Amino acid sequence: KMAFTLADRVTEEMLADKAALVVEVVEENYHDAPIVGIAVVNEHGRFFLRPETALADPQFVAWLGDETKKKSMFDSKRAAVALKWKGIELCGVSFDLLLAAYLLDPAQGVDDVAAAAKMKQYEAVRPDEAVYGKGAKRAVPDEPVLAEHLVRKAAAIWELERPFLDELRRNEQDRLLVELEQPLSSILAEMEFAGVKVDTKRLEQMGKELAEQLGTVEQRIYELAGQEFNINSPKQLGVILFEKLQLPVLKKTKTGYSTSADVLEKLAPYHEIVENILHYRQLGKLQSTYIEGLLKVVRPATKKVHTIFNQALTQTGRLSSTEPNLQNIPIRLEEGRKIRQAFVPSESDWLIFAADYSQIELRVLAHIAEDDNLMEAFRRDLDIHTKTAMDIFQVSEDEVTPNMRRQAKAVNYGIVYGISDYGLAQNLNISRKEAAEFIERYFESFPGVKRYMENIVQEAKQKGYVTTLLHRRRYLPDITSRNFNVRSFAERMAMNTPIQGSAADIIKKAMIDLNARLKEERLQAHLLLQVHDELILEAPKEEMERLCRLVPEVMEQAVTLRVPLKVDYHYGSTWYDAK
DNA sequence: GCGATCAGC
DNA sequence: ACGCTGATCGCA
Ligand SMILES: Nc1nc2c(ncn2[C@H]2C[C@H](O)[C@@H](COP(=O)(O)NP(=O)(O)OP(=O)(O)O)O2)c(=O)[nH]1
Numbered sequence: 001k002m003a004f005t006l007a008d009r010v011t012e013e014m015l016a017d018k019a020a021l022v023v024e025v026v027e028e029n030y031h032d033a034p035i036v037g038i039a040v041v042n043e044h045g046r047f048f049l050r051p052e053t054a055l056a057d058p059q060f061v062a063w064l065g066d067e068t069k070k071k072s073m074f075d076s077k078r079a080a081v082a083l084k085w086k087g088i089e090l091c092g093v094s095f096d097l098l099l100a101a102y103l104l105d106p107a108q109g110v111d112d113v114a115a116a117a118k119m120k121q122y123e124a125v126r127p128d129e130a131v132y133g134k135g136a137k138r139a140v141p142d143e144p145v146l147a148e149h150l151v152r153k154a155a156a157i158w159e160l161e162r163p164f165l166d167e168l169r170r171n172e173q174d175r176l177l178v179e180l181e182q183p184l185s186s187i188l189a190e191m192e193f194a195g196v197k198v199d200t201k202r203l204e205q206m207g208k209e210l211a212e213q214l215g216t217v218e219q220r221i222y223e224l225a226g227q228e229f230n231i232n233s234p235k236q237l238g239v240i241l242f243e244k245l246q247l248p249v250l251k252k253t254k255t256g257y258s259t260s261a262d263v264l265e266k267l268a269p270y271h272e273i274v275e276n277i278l279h280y281r282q283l284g285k286l287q288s289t290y291i292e293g294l295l296k297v298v299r300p301a302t303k304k305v306h307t308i309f310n311q312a313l314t315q316t317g318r319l320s321s322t323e324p325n326l327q328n329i330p331i332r333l334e335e336g337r338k339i340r341q342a343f344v345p346s347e348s349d350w351l352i353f354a355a356d357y358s359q360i361e362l363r364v365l366a367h368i369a370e371d372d373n374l375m376e377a378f379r380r381d382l383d384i385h386t387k388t389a390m391d392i393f394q395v396s397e398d399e400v401t402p403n404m405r406r407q408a409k410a411v412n413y414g415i416v417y418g419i420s421d422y423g424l425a426q427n428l429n430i431s432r433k434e435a436a437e438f439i440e441r442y443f444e445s446f447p448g449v450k451r452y453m454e455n456i457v458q459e460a461k462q463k464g465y466v467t468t469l470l471h472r473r474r475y476l477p478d479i480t481s482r483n484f485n486v487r488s489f490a491e492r493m494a495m496n497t498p499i500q501g502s503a504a505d506i507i508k509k510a511m512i513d514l515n516a517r518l519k520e521e522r523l524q525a526h527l528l529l530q531v532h533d534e535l536i537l538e539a540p541k542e543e544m545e546r547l548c549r550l551v552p553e554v555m556e557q558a559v560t561l562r563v564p565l566k567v568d569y570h571y572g573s574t575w576y577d578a579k
Numbered sequence: 580g581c582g583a584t585c586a587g588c
Numbered sequence: 589a590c591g592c593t594g595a596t597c598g599c600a
């Protein structure tokens with residue numbers, strides 16, 4: 001129903017200097033995944049290419065790598081990483097429909113060409129789920145069905161570039177796509193393909209000690225409970241805690257008693273068993289998610305793990321990391337922090353380098369709110385986390401422990417993002433009247449922040465959306481909702497995403513400037529991970545001293561704000577040691 | 580599959 | 589009744 005050439009070989013007209021390209025990878029995790037077919041649409045027509053002959057054709061391979069041959073794609077990082085696993089480099093991607101739809105509206109959840117095409121009333125293409133199926137019935141169709149689907153997806157990309165670029169221009173997002181998101185897409189592909197070396201023997205050893213330590217706490221729980229039960233079962237746990245031991249019921253779920261960590265901690269004065277349960281869950285958390293889960297996805301031949309950074313998922317412009325999630329590796333507890341010791345450099349005599357912003361969101365907030373006191377505080381390079389901990393616990397700076405500072409961290413972010421006196425009272429275990437007075441004192445010291453949070457909520461009502469400094473956008477229709485609860489959640493989003501999203505923009509530009517700087521200096525250093533406000537690199541030890549002056553300055557100079565940006569940096573033999 | 584729960588930023 | 593996530597697992 002759409003004409004296309006089911007090609008046997010590669011011809012010259014398939015190698016035009018502009019084309020829409022589809023390199024289809026159906027596997028969810030595209031690392032070392034098969035490429036099932038290729039489609040090319042250009043000024044000379046539409047073509048389908050079997051990959052086993054196109055990826056062996058030297059003319060087609062050189063065309064993929066020629067950055068002067070411009071390609072329009074959807075989810076180009078997926079194709080670039082899958083081609084890297086084939087030994088092939090993809091260059092010249094000038095338009096990515098996935099990232100263009102993500103900037104226009106992150107709430108659409110665009111996951112295939114059809115979903116993005118529907119935004120511009122283009123429907124001459126079927127959803128991937130309709131072609132490949134779901135679950136156990138998911139399979140690659142036969143060639144005449146697969147070929148048309150890929151050709152129709154390429155033809156859609158061919159027709160949709162101009163309408164998407166036009167709306168991006170109106171939204172002041174054209175530079176956000178071409179100079180930020182798309183260059184970052186190539187960087188993340190290099191990071192994902194590089195992987196991170198893992199000391200599997202160190203993990204496997206911890207897994208044996210965790211299993212023997214779990215049983216010790218397990219029997220102490222059975223002894224404290226008086227009987228044996230399924231500690232992971234909410235039904236039996238609720239019966240042991242709130243029926244047999246008759247502990248107070250502080251919170252309910254839709255299904256029964258709540259046993260979250262905040263509940264168990266308030267029950268600590270009532271029985272010893274709740275703290276053993278907390279320690280029991282924490283050991284099981286490390287065992288299930290970070291010992292077993294990490295060893296399951298590690299590449300045995302290289303001892304490397306290859307995460308996937310989802311660039312078009314979060315509503316604020318952050319990244320996310322899946323299978324494995326390398327953005328939530330434990331650190332706050334010392335027994336769980338040891339897992340970062342298993343993340344090691346990929347070569348001998350290389351080291352791990354980690355740099356991170358100091359309170360980037362609060363400094364971003366100070367610049368945007370133009371609050372005199374908050375700006376002055378960061379011009380003094382004050383640690384607002386420590387200062388707030390001093391005011392809360394009524395101590396001096398030398399008396400503030402890292403545990404108190406982490407609590408003040410939630411107070412600083414909580415207050416600026418709309419926490420209530422009720423919520424602050426429950427987080428600090430203080431009276432609700434003390435919380436309201438403390439929030440009152442917090443806003444009289446920073447009246448520009450309170451002014452900004454009121455103005456940004458009102459601007460979201462008038463425009464219907466909020467923006468970040470680099471013009472990333474998030475629509476908030478619920479901010480005019482007739483329901484109080486629904487509207488209140490939307491109001492806190494209006495307070496948060498311009499600040500969290502602007503911090504995501506800044507580090508995204510920092511990664512782009514860093515790689516150009518590294519290439520300029522002809523260094524072997526390269527990025528490994530991004531953890532929201534942290535950059536983790538590996539490099540030969542001979543490059544560490546150059547990086548101590550290069551990486552912080554690049555990150556601090558990504559943008560220029562009314563307050564400076566401060567970057568902390570450490571290096572060591574493991575990720576654990578890089579702090 | 581969903582939701583409670585928990586690891587991170 | 590601060591925000592943004594992903595993985596695990598019992599199933600009330
Ligand atoms: N709304 C909210 N955002 C948070 C929270 N925690 C972290 N974020 C988000 C906000 C920011 O985007 C980032 C800050 O996380 P860190 O690096 O752990 N703390 P910082 O860098 O300020 O101080 P230092 O590094 O010296 O310890 O993660 C929170 O409790 N609430």
Ligand SMILES: [Mn+2]
Pocket residue numbers: 356357358359360533
């Ligand atoms: Mn930080």
